[PDB]
Point group: C3
Chain length 334, copies 3
């Protein structure tokens, strides 16, 4: 008996985000999404380390879902028979039934349809949570993503001024726990089930072997660097479903940052580094002022440089010598 | 020569909180509390692991003390002769003498009486701190609690509106360090002194064996689940005296959150997950909208599901299908 | 063609800060600083453990640079031929070229001059970042400091009132990774290069052996305790270039705290413990109310008491019995 218009969304793989309006004149609708779970062995680093991943829609992170406050989000969650485990979905944006987890447990070969009303604005984690010790295991295996619930009037700075982004990227950060054998090489496994005992043992010690963006070391570099132009306002949504992170744009700032990720709160301004609490998403916007390469990292630099947690931006435009200039290039000391 | 009325409080064990007013028409009083230190061997998990605990009033955490801004808090701290170690108390709410620690060092068989003026509003940690390496050891052995200093007009949202809670719970989170023997079983000790060398060695490696609420795995589940009804506004005070935490109510939100815990600051609104800095208390209020079971966790889900850090709420009332509904129950994929 | 007045600054070693104005009637100037890199073996604890340090200006942290919004900061970075490695500098306060890192890479025997416009207010990290895995290694070897960019009208409370400090201290916190040999003693190395392989192995495990202020256990105690008088407002700038911290003044508070460190945001009030995200600086001001000794710690008390992260303040003045009093000294229990 919920008589509103229905709108289908075609999700796109991260770090890109499906097309959407910021401010809208649409009223509430039932926005329809489909997520199909895929368990798969993937490569996570440039050395060829493999990993028993569990994913929504084939990606780590799962895709970003975007709706507006007061929309109803109707998700068909599909667990094909080619998977081995039960799965479900918990939306941190939703109210009741463990975020939906208690209404969405599906065995291989099943699907379920959950609807929730988007009553809270912000960016939020979604993740699998089948019960007990399986909860962390599915999450750290990759079964997490995010959903953005925009105000119908779009974003604002808390001081009456609209904040409109020219583009948005979703960076999902994943702590991974890959065991090593006696001589110190990473182990490979034939199935997630086979990976579980060694993986849980390592998980409980709370030190990841890898911390990656978009599912692999280097995922958001080279051909797949993020991009912008001088003058463009870019929103960067960052999530971490299990473990804290401290994002930083090297050579830039967070002009407007919602580190707790919730648009009912005004953004902070002019940050160097912000903090994503494990189990949350946050967002930062920056207007690029200088061309060139930037790195986007977690600012535990050991994690960034040595465990995988670095993305790049390639930015086009004109250099601004007022903001920064090399007065004297490297030369012998007099 | 401090000539104000005296009021005794009968403390109650966590997660419950002694009776108190939110807004009050009372002026300042001298509010009298007694804390009696107990060292004791306790069971911390469902496997029967034992732990050399050190407690205020027999509990982990120590009980929540509640006063109003401008009250004087007069604590009789008692260290019975049946204990083995010196102890003291540091109130993060207090000004001077290391929070009181420098005025309250008592050997077994002694007591001391400290008064401090409640000039800062919020929730605050209190903990033992006898000196040097004993400081962390006593804290991580359980010797910590919290004190709430309310505004005399009660809580507000920073926008002129009163925030009144229907009930309050105190969740004290404890990082514990229980060593293992060569084959990998947790060790048991005959006294705290005997536990110290192995425990310190483990402590310095900064990875707990257990992270619990209310002193044990499962403490706030089953018979001892937290409770609410749909429509009730519940305040959840969360403390962690030594290590960070990231609280999250699964299936709910933080409607109003003071993550740094201090009522001179407006609350943030509509959070998914908040952050308790080690060495602090914070508070979150939520009005329940849906019946059923909720889990309240730290959202490092490894800690929550595998190391002990999960509580439950059981909530009574009517399900709201507008907020959430299972449109199609699990079924075979077409 | 940048035609502004030039002003030289003589930097001073932490925890002290070079002389500067808070509010100023000066307009923009080119403020000139020199940093000379020194690699050196130092002692980091009272047991005589040694450490292959890499420093700006000989200190850990590097010195605090202080300017005003809209100044241009012109740094001559010098890498003497007596050093072994290339080095550079990344200012989190600066815009473009990886914070300056991409314009300042200098081999031993070279210097470079970088200018950047101080368009963002707050306290910010600066650090070396030569590329790749060298980034974390140089940072955790000591190559980090901070720069404070004040509003030209000085600090304010966000409610229209000026906040003027009577003194400022800079506490730089350093996570250090010193490997151990088979029997468990800390290793010593003949050069940073020789320390690298064992040090990187340890770094990737994300547990420091030492967490210190001002470069060594006990650096800011005894003769070198911080000082104040009752009635003095002290600003404490705290930085951590790689790893989170949770500052706390034992026996005091943070009266006004910018935990994310950026003066475009109002301070929070009345904190017990605040949070410095790794890769940032923050600042807290406190007006002392009581004489005596205070400890300033990270409130992971294991880190504070056992790994090195404790400073002291010695405060002169008159005790205030209204704020705190020992009603009854320790005595036998009746
Ligand atoms: O940015 C959110 C922040 O801004 C304030 C105004 O200071 O409210 C603005 O944003 C609200 C949510 O979008 C709007 O409903 C409101 O009309 C607008 O002024 C704060 O109240 C809020 O915390
Ligand atoms: O919620 C605290 C926050 O609210 C403001 C008003 O925006 O002040 C309110 O709360 C103060 C502390 O309880 C009251 O003294 C004040 O009268 C009331 O308006 C902020 O100033 C404060 O940060
Ligand atoms: O403390 C910064 C905070 O204060 C406000 C007023 O609430 O602005 C003050 O500080 C600004 C930066 O120094 C000044 O430009 C402004 O004039 C002054 O009122 C906030 O806007 C700001 O977030
Ligand atoms: O070689 N086994 O881990
Ligand atoms: O500035 N970042 O390493
Ligand atoms: O290249 N030396 O000035
Ligand atoms: O068996 N000793 O730890
Ligand atoms: O939603 N919590 O795992
Ligand atoms: O039960 N299958 O539709
Ligand atoms: O003794 N070698 O580490
Ligand atoms: O109050 N500090 O340990
Ligand atoms: O010293 N005993 O009261
Ligand atoms: Cu799953
Ligand atoms: Cu969750
Ligand atoms: Cu004690
Ligand atoms: Cu403390
Ligand atoms: Cu360097
Ligand atoms: Cu940096």
């Amino acid at each position: 008996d919920l008589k509103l218009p229905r709108q289908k969304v075609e999700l796109v793989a991260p770090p890109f985000v499906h097309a959407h309006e910021q401010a809208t004149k649409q009223g509430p609708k039932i926005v329809e999404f489909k997520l199909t779970i895929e368990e798969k062995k993937v490569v996570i680093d440039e050395k060829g380390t493999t990993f028993q991943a569990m994913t929504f829609n084939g990606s780590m992170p799962g895709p970003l879902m975007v709706v507006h406050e007061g929309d109803y989000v109707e998700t068909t969650l599909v667990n094909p028979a080619t998977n081995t485990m039960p799965h479900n979905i918990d939306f941190h944006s939703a109210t009741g039934a463990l975020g939906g987890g208690a209404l969405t447990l599906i065995n291989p070969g099943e699907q379920v349809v959950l609807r929730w009303k988007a009553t809270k604005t912000g960016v939020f984690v979604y993740h699998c949570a089948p019960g007990g010790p399986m909860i962390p295991w599915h999450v750290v295996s990759g079964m997490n993503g995010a959903v953005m619930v925009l105000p119908r009037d779009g974003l604002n700075d808390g001081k009456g001024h609209a904040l409109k982004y020219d583009k948005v990227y979703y960076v999902g950060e994943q702590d991974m726990y890959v065991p090593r054998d006696e001589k110190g090489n990473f182990k490979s496994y034939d199935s997630p089930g086979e990976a579980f005992t060694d993986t849980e043992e390592m998980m409980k010690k709370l030190i990841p072997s890898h911390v990656v963006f978009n599912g692999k070391v280097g995922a958001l570099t080279g051909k797949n660097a993020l991009t912008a132009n001088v003058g463009e306002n870019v929103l960067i949504v960052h999530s971490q479903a299990n473990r804290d992170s401290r994002p930083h744009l090297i050579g830039g700032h967070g002009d407007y940052v919602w580190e707790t990720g919730k648009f009912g709160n005004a953004p902070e301004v002019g940050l160097e580094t912000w903090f994503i609490r494990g189990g949350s998403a946050g967002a930062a916007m920056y207007k690029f002022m200088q061309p060139g390469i930037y790195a986007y990292v977690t600012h535990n630099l050991i994690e960034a440089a040595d465990l995988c947690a670095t993305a790049h931006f390639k930015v086009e435009g004109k250099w601004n010598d007022d903001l920064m200039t090399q007065v004297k290039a490297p030369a012998e000391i007099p």
